[PDB]
């Protein structure tokens, strides 16, 4: 059957506003979270947030500009970067019955809804919410704001997932090239960032809280000590190409994905059952004959999800477990700019031979024992990588990818 | 290729809380708009709504429903009654890696988003947004918040695309079955009715609002005196399956999803372009060996869409119309709910032989001539359905259903 490719990549990211800032800061073992007034003033128990660093005031034009929220406009500068990465030019990708964009939220934009229902309930009512909430708030915001700008012609829709949003939306973008239908299809995701939405994660318990004063090591996948994750925002897309026609393009071809897992859990509402991601991964490696040289974890900084996560890698790999890290002790957790954003974090890995550093693991969890997660950045000439996600509602994606 | 059937259909609409109640009022002509005291008091202009008749406590057990918005309730009864209508035990659909769920939302819930703002600003803080705002709120919350009481293992996730997300849904379901990775997928969506997405709705001008003394005569597809759409909530579900599976078990086939169109318009942000819409038809009728008998159009009662879609029609079929009706001007709009709700009331006219209604249209607009418009209920023996959603942000989908 056909096979999809990765030919370009555009990210906007707590830890770099283009591939450049953001290999540096993988190299680095940087860490793209801050202190937040906006998180403190409101109310919430968490104060740290992975925000992008970016002023995106006219990066856009006004007649696109106007319908956004803020995960299209990461998203769209994302697409941006992704199709000039790739190459492509306006007379290939548009008006093309064969190119498609497949981009989504988990959240959509509570801040714009709740900007309408609040203007709504002011003395000037229809008056002070104006014309351009409905584009900003539906759950379709940043496909729909993406795909005409653009000129897409092929699909068009969002996928959400929660964590696994943007992973599901590149798997997605794989299965539109295996069946035939498009030649490429732009995929991703953007996530806001603001209180109203956080102080929802705040509310369920799920936001580090104890390391406000520290904002660099609230996020701490793995170590004894972590208190949940730190919510971020941003963006990302990929340009997802069946292989002959790159190939004919002269394209520069980052990896194949050659493999695509997708299941759920059937279990609880907000923790994961370990078994369903067995399988996810499971699905992912089928057929894949090469050994996972890196797996970039979902590993949120959560007491629970960190190690169900790590004894599912355990039983999938059994005495061969690759080389991991959780970038998210660097980036925080984008929500539904996740699964993309950490794709690319994996493809510049595989790509420029390094894995990322697992950073803040001051004592490591004793159900982390004996695998190797690496804590300082280690060149290594990477074949196969690994990425998983896996999003509250016991939804699981998993994307493995490899060079050609 | 894999051959998708649908095997069992589950509805809570504006027009009747199951499939027999839905029947009758497609045959009748019936509206379900009613007047609205809340829309009203909100301080909209639109006062009119298709809402869902029918007092849910109780219906849904409380650890079940604790995490769910009210478009998460309707897919949920929706889901519960297309499985009793597909035969399905439990020990058939659950824990199964090969039963899936594509489920979405238009919205999400715009409610709970600002219920979890207003809560966080009052006195009590996180403890009065309460731990279950995230599933309610956020854009895959149809998907989970069925995914895990059904116990499904399979595909889990959501689409959205505006008034197409529940068409787009169907369809990849039917691509799930195509790749060969599900046997089933249950597939639909649901959207809450609220003032909270409403208003944003009315101040953008699209919400009919020159017919509040007369709810039932708010929604009037291609009448000359058409003002906007009337907002309604609801749910949907089928059972999409794959043919040898349902055939084997002894299932109840009401038809095959023989076309599945979805394209983008790529233009102008606000209006369809009408070019993606017909090519959104051609592809979901290639290669479909017999005429479209009866086309469920998407017809929401604005001035500029309606009319649109009839052009689009034109090109698409030239002299040889289908039998056409806009099954909206019964139901209102229910948007994320909109796709399998529609795909629903074609079966049922498949399922059962007639042609439902174009009710309201007083004077046919001038650009309407030369088509198969019908108005009156009648009985006819149909063959092949086609159902279009066009979403605003030029996305659209397509559905072609035929015997077999
Ligand atoms: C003017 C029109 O016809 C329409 S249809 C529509 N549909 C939806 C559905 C679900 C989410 C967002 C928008 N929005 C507008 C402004």
Same mark, same amino acid.
């Given at each position: 059957m056909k096979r999809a490719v990765i030919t370009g990549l555009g990210i906007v990211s707590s830890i770099g506003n283009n591939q450049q800032e953001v290999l540096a800061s993988l190299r680095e073992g940087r860490s793209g979270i801050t202190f937040s007034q906006?998180?403190?003033?409101?109310?919430? !128990?968490? %104060?740290?947030?992975?925000?992008?660093?970016?002023?995106?005031? +006219?990066?856009?034009? !006004?007649?696109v500009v106007r319908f956004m929220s803020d995960a299209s406009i990461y998203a769209f500068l994302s697409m941006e970067q992704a199709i000039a990465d790739a190459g492509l030019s306006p007379e290939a990708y548009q008006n093309n019955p064969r190119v498609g964009l497949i981009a989504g939220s988990g959240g959509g934009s509570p801040r714009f809804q709740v900007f309408g229902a609040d203007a709504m309930r002011?003395?000037?009512?229809?008056?002070?919410?104006?014309? $351009?909430?409905?584009?900003?708030?539906? =759950?379709?915001?940043?496909? @729909?704001?993406? *795909?005409?700008?653009?000129?897409? %012609?092929?699909?068009? $829709?969002?996928?959400?997932?929660?964590?696994?949003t943007s992973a599901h939306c590149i798997g997605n973008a794989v299965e539109q090239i295996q069946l035939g239908k498009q030649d490429?299809?732009? =995929?991703?995701? /953007?996530? #806001?960032?603001?209180?109203?939405? =956080?102080?929802?994660?705040? @509310?369920? /318990?799920?936001?580090?809280?104890? $390391?406000?004063?520290?904002?660099?090591?609230?996020?701490?996948?793995?170590?004894? %000590?972590?208190?949940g994750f730190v919510i971020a925002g941003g963006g990302g897309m990929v340009?997802? #190409?069946?292989?002959?026609?790159?190939?004919? !393009? +002269? @394209?520069?071809? $980052? *990896? #194949?994905?050659?493999?695509? +897992?997708?299941?759920?859990?059937?279990?609880?509402?907000?923790?994961?059952?370990?078994?369903g991601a067995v399988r996810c991964m499971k699905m992912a490696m089928h057929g894949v004959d090469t050994p996972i040289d890196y797996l970039n974890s979902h590993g949120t900084s959560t007491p629970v999800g960190d190690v169900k996560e790590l004894a599912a890698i355990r039983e999938v790999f059994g005495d061969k477990s690759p080389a991991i890290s959780a970038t998210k002790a660097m980036t925080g957790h984008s929500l539904?700019? *996740?699964?993309?954003?950490? =794709?690319?974090?994996?493809?510049?890995?595989?790509?420029?031979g390094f894995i990322a550093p697992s950073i803040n693991i001051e004592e490591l969890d004793e159900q982390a024992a004996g695998l190797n997660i690496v804590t300082e950045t280690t060149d290594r000439e990477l074949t196969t990588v690994m990425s998983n996600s896996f999003g509250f509602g016991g939804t699981n994606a998993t994307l493995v990818m490899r060079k050609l």
């Open positions: 906006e998180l403190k003033d409101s109310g919430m !128990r968490s %104060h740290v947030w992975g925000n992008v660093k970016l002023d995106t005031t +006219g990066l856009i034009d !006004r007649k002011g003395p000037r009512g229809l008056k002070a919410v104006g014309p $351009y909430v409905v584009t900003k708030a539906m =759950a379709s915001g940043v496909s @729909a704001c993406l *795909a005409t700008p653009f000129k897409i %012609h092929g699909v068009n $829709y969002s996928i959400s997932s929660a964590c696994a490429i299809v732009f =995929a991703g995701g /953007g996530e #806001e960032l603001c209180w109203e939405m =956080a102080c929802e994660f705040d @509310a369920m /318990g799920a936001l580090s809280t104890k $390391y406000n004063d520290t904002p660099e090591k609230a996020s701490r996948t793995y170590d004894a %000590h972590r208190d340009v997802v #190409e069946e292989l002959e026609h790159a190939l004919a !393009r +002269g @394209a520069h071809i $980052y *990896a #194949e994905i050659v493999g695509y +897992g997708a299941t759920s859990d059937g279990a609880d509402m907000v923790a994961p059952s370990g078994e539904g700019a *996740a699964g993309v954003q950490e =794709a690319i974090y994996s493809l510049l890995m595989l790509e420029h």
